[PDB]
Structure formats: structure tokens, C-alpha cells
């Protein structure tokens, strides 16, 4: 049984915490607590990790750290991450343009500035979103008919900046219905729904934005 090891909180590794529910395939996790940040410098390096971060995935010698290299691996794990060049650059482009927001949130979010350093990032947030609900038009999925991993993501994303502001979507209701369409998957609406769900915070629990042990 595979290993996921980061904080307790959405942060960096919700989306994969999806796509694995999502395969239903069974891992355990090691969750640091707010307050265990020695805990984990305890075993940083008692992993045999090459790149001690968080979050790591280990399983038969499997090391891995790097959020994006961990979600591709359990992606390609099951042939998801494309078929050729074209597809398989065509999913990356999305993994980077969901990043480009769900990051946008994470770097004005620990400044002290965030209550208005968001206002910037709500008025280009729009631009974004659409570019988003385009590639949504006639397709059920970014990426087609079949679930990938940036569908985990914009998800994990359009969850995120919804907290910020609980008005950025309704001006893209395809994307309202994305995000319905996949808390319907049962396996991932059965999650939800389970105690294995991390609710809350977004960030760091340092953080300005979506932080605080419980949301406000």
C-alpha cells in the first residue's frame, strides 16, 4: 500500500488525494498536523528521499517529492497522461494553465497585503476561468470524454477560489456544472462524504487566506 506524506490541509496535494480516491486505488497517508512541523524534519531525511520535500509519495522504492511528478505518476500508473505527443502535451497544457490559478490563490495568500493583493487577482481571475469554459464547450471533460488529472485540478482550484469570492462562477455556468458533474462521480462524492475528507484550510494554516484551523 502506497504512502502519500504532506500537511493536513488541501494545499499542494488535493487534487492527486482525488485521482487516487477516484481509481479507487487504496494508499494510507501520514498527515502532519499543525503542530508536528519537527515531526517531519524528525523523518525529512530518515525516507530516502533525493529531493526531501513535501508532499512525498513512496511506495517499492518509488521515491517521490514534487506535487506535479507525484500526480503524473499515479496518472501514468494507469495510462492516463496521453496517448502521443499531441494528447500528452495537450494534458500538460492544461496542468499548467491550472496551475497558473490555483497558484495565482497560494502567492498573495501568506502576504499580510492579501485583503488587497486579491482584488487584482479577482478582476484577471475572469480571463482565466473562460478560457477554461471554451475548452469545456462540447466536451464533457477537459481533454475529451475520459477523466484526466487536470479535471482534478481545475476542480480543486474552482473549490478554492470560490472561498475567495462565492461569485467568480456565476458568470460560467459550465463551470458550476463541471464541478457538479464531478462531486457526482460516486467515487469521489462517496469521499466527500468520508471522514478522509481534509474540509479545511486551503493553505498553510499560517496563511492570510484560507487558513485558521477552521474556516470563518
Known amino acids: 500500500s502506497p504512502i502519500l506524506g504532506y500537511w493536513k490541509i488541501k494545499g499542494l496535494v488535493q487534487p492527486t488525494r482525488l485521482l487516487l480516491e477516484y481509481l479507487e486505488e487504496k494508499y494510507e497517508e501520514h498527515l502532519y498536523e499543525r503542530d508536528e512541523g519537527d515531526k517531519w524534519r524528525n523523518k525529512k531525511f530518515e525516507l530516502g528521499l533525493e ?42 497544457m492544461l496542468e499548467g494553465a491550472v496551475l497558473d490559478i490555483r497558484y495565482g490563490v497560494s502567492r498573495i495568500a501568506y502576504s499580510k497585503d492579501f485583503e488587497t493583493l486579491k482584488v487584482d487577482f479577482l478582476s484577471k481571475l475572469p480571463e482565466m476561468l473562460k478560457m477554461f469554459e471554451d475548452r469545456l464547450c462540447h466536451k464533457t471533460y ?24 462565492p461569485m467568480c462562477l456565476d458568470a460560467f455556468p459550465k463551470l458550476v456544472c463541471f464541478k457538479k458533474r464531478i462531486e457526482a462521480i460516486p467515487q469521489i462524492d462517496k469521499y466527500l462524504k468520508s471522514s478522509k475528507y481534509i474540509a479545511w484550510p486551503l493553505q498553510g494554516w499560517q496563511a492570510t487566506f484560507g487558513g485558521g484551523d477552521h474556516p470563518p
Open 51 to 92: 529531493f526531501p520535500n513535501l508532499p512525498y509519495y513512496i511506495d517499492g522504492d518509488v521515491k517521490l517529492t514534487q506535487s506535479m511528478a507525484i500526480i503524473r505518476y499515479i496518472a501514468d500508473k494507469h495510462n492516463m497522461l496521453g496517448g502521443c505527443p499531441k494528447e500528452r502535451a495537450e494534458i500538460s
Open 142 to 165: 477537459l481533454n475529451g470524454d475520459h477523466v484526466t488529472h487536470p479535471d482534478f485540478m481545475l476542480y480543486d482550484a474552482l473549490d478554492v477560489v470560490l472561498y475567495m469570492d
